[model samples]
Target chain A: SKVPGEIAELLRGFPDVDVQEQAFAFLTVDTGGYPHSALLSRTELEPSTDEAVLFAVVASPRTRANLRRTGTAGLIAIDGTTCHHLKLRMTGSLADRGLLACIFSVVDHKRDDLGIPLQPMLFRTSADLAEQEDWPRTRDLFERLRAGYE
Target chain B: SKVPGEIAELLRGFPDVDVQEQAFAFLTVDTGGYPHSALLSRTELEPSTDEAVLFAVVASPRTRANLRRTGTAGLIAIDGTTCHHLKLRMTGSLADRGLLACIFSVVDHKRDDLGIPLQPMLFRTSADLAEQEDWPRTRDLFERLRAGYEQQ
Candidate 1:
C-alpha cells in the first residue's frame, strides 16, 4: 500500500524511531528501540469531524491558487535576497515514486494548520533532525527549504 | 523518473494518444489509444507552505498514538444496512489494483478539484474505456472505495 510503503522506508533509515499517521484507520508506529528512549508516532482524526475536513479542504484549495512558487534546492541569491533554492531533476523510472515519497514524508509531517494534510512530515524531520547540534547543515537546509525562493 | 514509469504505463494503456506531462503541467489525452477515444489529463504543484508544513509536524505526534487495529472492520455487519455492507472484502489483488487505478483516473481528472498539478491525458483512457461498461462489479467496488466505509 502507498501509505505503508512511505512509512516503512523512512523507518529503515531511522530504525530507532516510531511513526504515526492519519487515514481511514487511526495509525501508529512504535520504534521501541530508541534511547531517551522512544521514537513515538501517531495522528488524530484530523479536524475531528467531516465538516472540518470539508472546510479545510475547500479553503486550503482556494488559498493555494494564489500562492507563489517557492521552489526547493540550495541557496539561490536573487536581487541580493538569498532565497531558498529548489531545483529537482528526475531520471529513470522511479522519479514520481521517489518524489511522491519525498512529498508524502513532507506532507505526513508538515500538515497545513487546518489539518488539510499538506506536507506534515516535512516539518517533523526538520524540527527533529535538523534542530540537533550535530546536524547543523541539516537544520540549515531545512531553514532554506522553509524560506522559499524570493 | 518515478513519475515517468507509472505515468508512461498510464499513457501506453491509452490507444491512439501520444501524451506526456511533468510536475505542474496539466493536459488531457483523447482521440486514439488502447482504451481509445478521448480522455483528460492535467497536473500541477500543490503547496507546502512554511506554516502549513510546521503544523503537519506538530500534528504527527497525535497521529502516532492512534494507529491501533480497533476492530471497526469486524464490528460492522454487512447485512444490516447500506452502511454495513462495506466492511467485507470481496475483491482480489487485481481488483484492488483496479480500484486504485480508477481512483488515480478520477484524481487525474479532478486535479483542479484537488488543488494540485494534475495530468489529464494519463487518466482520460480510463474514462474512455469506462463507456464500454465492461466492469460493473469493478465500478461498484470503486464506488465503495471512493465513498469510503463511513456511511454518511
Candidate 2:
C-alpha cells in the first residue's frame, strides 16, 4: 500500500527533458514469459486512483513487438540522484497509430533504496568501491568522457 | 574479425574496484528465446584469444536457474566513462556448487562507439550529455552516492 501519492507524482514528472541527461528508466518485460530489458529515454505518466498509466518510447522494434504481443512490462525509474527507485509492473495496451505508444497500468509497485534491498534480486553487487584504489582513474576517465560531449 | 585484442584486454581488466562506484553491466538472455535481463556487478573476466570467460554472480535464483537451463546469455559492458561498450554472447557452464558461479565463454563479441552504433539493437540513446543542462546535477549526485559508501 506504499504506492504513495508522491510516487505517482514522480512518475507523472518523468523523462523530464530538463533532466534527460540523467533521467533514464529501465523497462523490463516477460515476453512469452521470458525477461527482457530496454533502456528508456522518453516517458509520459498519467495517474488514476490506485493505478497509473505510463506512455513511453522504447528503444527497439523488437521491444515494441514483444510488448504488443505479450502486454506486460516491468519498469524501474532512477532519479539519478537519491537512493529511491520506483519499480512497477504494468499490463500494456498499444495505442496511438503505428504502434507508437504503449498505454500501461501499474499492476505492482515497490521502492528499493540504494538498490540494496533489490540486490541479488534485481542487481548483483560486483565490486565494493570503498575497497578499490582505482576510483581516481575511473573518476577521471568518467569526467573526461562526459566532457567530450560538451 | 574486429574483435580487437584491446577489447579482450579490456574485458580481462574489468570489475575495476576504482570505478566500482559506477561500473555495472547488463546481462540478458533468451530463455526458450524470450529475452530477460539481470544487472551484474561481481564479474571476473578471463580472456583466451578472441574469447573470454566470464565469472559473475547474477541477481536472482530464477536467473541462475535460467542460465543453467539455457546456457546462453547476452552481456553489455559499458565503460561508465567512455562511449566504448563491449557486447558479448556467451555460452554458460554452471560451475562451482549450488549455482553460485556461472562460467561463461564468450562466443561472440562486438564493440560499439558513440553509443549510436548499438542503438535499437542494444541500448537506446537518451539525452546527449553535450546538450544537457542537468549533467552537472547528475554528476554531482553520482559522486555523492559513491561517497556515501566511502563514509560508511
Candidate 3:
C-alpha cells in the first residue's frame, strides 16, 4: 500500500501531456548546489528496482557540464492544478546513447505538499491595449484588472 | 514613445501584487551560463535614474553565494495572467541591509512575448486524499481525472 521510495515510479506513471503540453513537471539542478529549474517536455522516465529512475534528456552542453561537475540532479513533478509534488534527487552520469543518458541512483525521495494558494491580481497594462483588435479576450482581462486597480 | 533600456521604469509601472502574490516576477542567474530561476515574493523593487533598480531579496545561501561569485542577476517580471514578460539582466553586489540588497545596473533590458498556452491534466492522488473528508471537491476532481485515465 505504501511505496517508500517509489517517487520515481509515481512520476513515470503520469501521462505524456503533463510534460509535453502543459509542462506540469519541472526539473531543477544544483550548480555548485544552487537550484536552477527548467520545464520538461518530450521526456522519457523509467523506474527500476536496482537503481533510481532513468531519465533520457537531450544533453545540452551546459547540462553535460553541470553533470560532469556535480553528477547530481533534482526533479519535481506536479500536474498543473494539483498539490502532491514528487521530488527525486539522484546521483548519476550522462552516457552517450545517441541522445544523452541520465542513468542515476536514487539518493533521496519525498512527496511535498506545495499546494500554495494561487491568487488572481490586478494588472496595469501598457497604454496600447485598446488599440489591439486581435486580442479581445486578453484586452478584456486587462481592462477588468485595470478597473479593479483604479 | 518607446522607452529604450528602461526595463526598471517599465517594471516600476506594474502593480505590487504581481511581485508579492501572483509572483509573476521570476529571478534567474547564470550557473556557468545556464539559467536557474527562483520566484520572488513580498519583495520591493524601485528604479532610480542616477543609480539602478534596487531589489530586496531574502537571499538564500545559494543566492548569496551566486551574487558573491558572479555579482550579476537576471530578473523577469510578468503581470498576473498576462503574456508580456519583462527581462532585466543586472550586475551588482550584495549589501548588508537586514535583507540582502541586489543593487546593480541594468546591463540588458527587453520585453519578450512569452505567451505559452496552459493546459489541464489527469492527476493521480496520494492515498491520503481519501482520508480527508473536508476535501470533497478535490476528491471529485481527482476521481474525474482518474475516470478519464481509466477510460483511456
Candidate 4:
C-alpha cells in the first residue's frame, strides 16, 4: 500500500534467491548540500515493516548525518530492466542497536520504468567480519531491523 | 599508466559480452555540494583513449556543471568482486555533440578488489534514440572523444 509491491517484496527479503547481489544506490543530501551516493548491500539496508525500510551500515557517517539533518533520501534498486526509484523520508531511528540505523517510508517512486540481468553491481562485505565480530550479532541485528522500532 | 589496466579495458569496450549490462555509477557534487550518482549505460559513457573516458548523455546538466566547477567526481566499475574506484579530474568538454558531454582522466584509483557474475546491474536505454537520432553522430562522437581533446 505504501511502496511499489515489487520493491516492497525486495526490501522485505530474499528467500530462495541466494548467491545473487542486489545492491542499492543510496542517495542523501550533502551541504544542506549535494547528493551523496553510497552502495548498500541487502545486509545493511532492510525492511523494518510493511510501511517502512531501515538503513544501517558499517561506516557511513556522512550518510547518517544527511538523514539526521534533512530527513530525505533516494534509493535506486534494480532487478532486470526494472528500476525502483524510492524517495525516502525519515520517520524514526533505531540507534539503540548501537550501529548507524534509521527508519524511513517510501514517499514516492518511479522506474525504467531499470535491472540485474545485466552485470549486477557487487559489493564486497566483511565476509570475514560477518562470521566473527561475527555470527551472534548479525542474527540479532537482522531481527531488530524487522521488529525493533515503534 | 594513467589508469588501472583492468578498468581501462572495461572503459575501452566490451566486445564479446552481448546480453549482460555493465552499468557505471557516475558521481558528481550536486549542490555546488554533495555527491550525486547516476547510472550510465555503456553507450553513454566510454573510452576515447587509455587515460580518458568521456561521459555524454541524452540528458544531464548538473553532472556537467559539478565537473566544470569542481573538476571532480568518482566512477565505480565492477568486473567481478573487483570494484574499480576511479577518482576523476575533468579536463575538457565534448559539447560539440550538443549533449551533456565531458572528458575525464582517472587521477586516482582503488578497488575491493568489485563485479558482474552475481545478478549484474542493468540499465534500460532509449533504443529508438540509438538507431535514429540516428547512428552517424554516435560514431563521430566516439571518434571525437578519442581525438578531440587535443585541440581543446
DockQ of each: 0.02, 0.04, 0.04, 0.29
- Candidate No. with top lDDT: 4
**RMSD (Cα, Å) of model 2:** 16.6
- For candidate 4, chain B by itself scores a TM value of 0.74
Docking quality (DockQ) of candidate 3: 0.04
> Order of all candidates by lDDT, from best down to worst?
4, 2, 3, 1
The CA lDDT at B47 in model 1 is 12
lDDT of each: 0.18, 0.39, 0.38, 0.59
CA RMSD per model (angstroms): 22.4, 16.6, 18.4, 4.8
Tens-place lDDT per residue, model 4, B1-152, is 26666766776653232344567777765442334556665666666654545445434465666666677777767666565556676766666544655666666676643333433365434555355344356556666666666554
Per-residue CA lDDT of candidate 2, range B1-152, in tens? 33446545455532322232222334444333334444443233334333434444443565566666655555544442223333343343333333333445554454433322221111111244213323334334333433433354
Descending-DockQ candidate ranking:
4, 2, 3, 1
Residue B46 deviation, candidate 2, in Å? 5.0
| Docking band of candidate 4 | acceptable
In candidate 1, how many Å is residue A131 off? 38
Backbone atom clashes (below 3 Å) for every candidate = 67, 9, 0, 18
Instruction: Mark the regions of model 3 whose C-alpha exceeds 4 Å error after superposition.
Output: A1-10, A14-37, A45-54, A59-61, A69-72, A76-98, A105-115, A118-150, B1-38, B42-54, B59-62, B69-98, B104-152
lDDT of 1: 0.18
Question: Where in model 1 is the C-alpha error above 4 Å?
Answer: A1-150, B1-128, B131-135
Better of 3 and 4 by TM-score: 4
TM-score of each model's B chain? 0.19, 0.47, 0.47, 0.74
Best by DockQ: 4
